[PDB]
């Protein structure tokens, strides 16, 4: 019951309740039948303070759901730069591959987030990683017409 309440607290930005539930023994690594953890939900919905509290209390920064999606994948796709930075500082795998072969860099390129792309690159994101469709992050930025992101990915590749 505490784990379900913790998932819901993360979903709805219930920071104070997150603290209370974990003081009362809730598993910070509670996981639903889809593989989704409180940290995934806080990352997806942009709840930065909840991300921080969960990490402080032992959340697995690299939890994969049943599709191989990590909290970093979700924060990168949803445009939450500070969360991206916090997750990386806590040891998030910058080049985690989901079941489609997409990395956080692929998703940040897919959703056109320039500074998130840049931070991922500064932390070692792999410009040569291909997803299961043969696409690198650069290919995605070409496909979606984002010239600024394509330029920074091409620069990164040239200087590797």
């Amino acid at each position: 019951d505490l784990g379900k309440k913790l998932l819901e607290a993360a979903y709805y930005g219930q920071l104070d309740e997150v603290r209370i539930l974990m003081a009362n023994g809730a598993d910070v690594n509670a996981v639903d039948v889809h593989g989704i953890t409180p940290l995934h939900l806080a990352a997806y919905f942009g709840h930065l303070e909840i991300v921080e509290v969960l990490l402080k209390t032992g959340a697995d920064v690299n939890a994969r759901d049943n599709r191989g999606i990590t909290p970093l994948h979700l924060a990168a796709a949803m445009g939450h730069l500070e969360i991206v930075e916090v997750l990386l500082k806590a040891g998030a795998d910058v080049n985690a591959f989901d079941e489609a072969g997409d990395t956080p860099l692929h998703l940040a390129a897919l959703k056109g987030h320039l500074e998130i792309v840049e931070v991922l690159l500064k932390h070692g994101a792999d410009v040569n990683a291909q997803d299961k469709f043969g696409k690198t992050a650069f290919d995605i930025s070409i496909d979606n017409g984002n010239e600024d992101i394509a330029e920074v990915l091409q620069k990164a590749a040239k200087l590797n």
Binding site: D32, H34, I36, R67, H73, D98, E99, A100, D102, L107
Partner: peptide, 20 residues
């Protein structure tokens, strides 16, 4: 449904999140 190509695993997780 979810279209086949880049992002499909992300979108599938997003859909599941949307049903919680």
């Amino acid at each position: 449904s979810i279209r086949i190509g880049p992002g499909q695993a992300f979108y599938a997780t997003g859909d599941i999140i949307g049903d919680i």
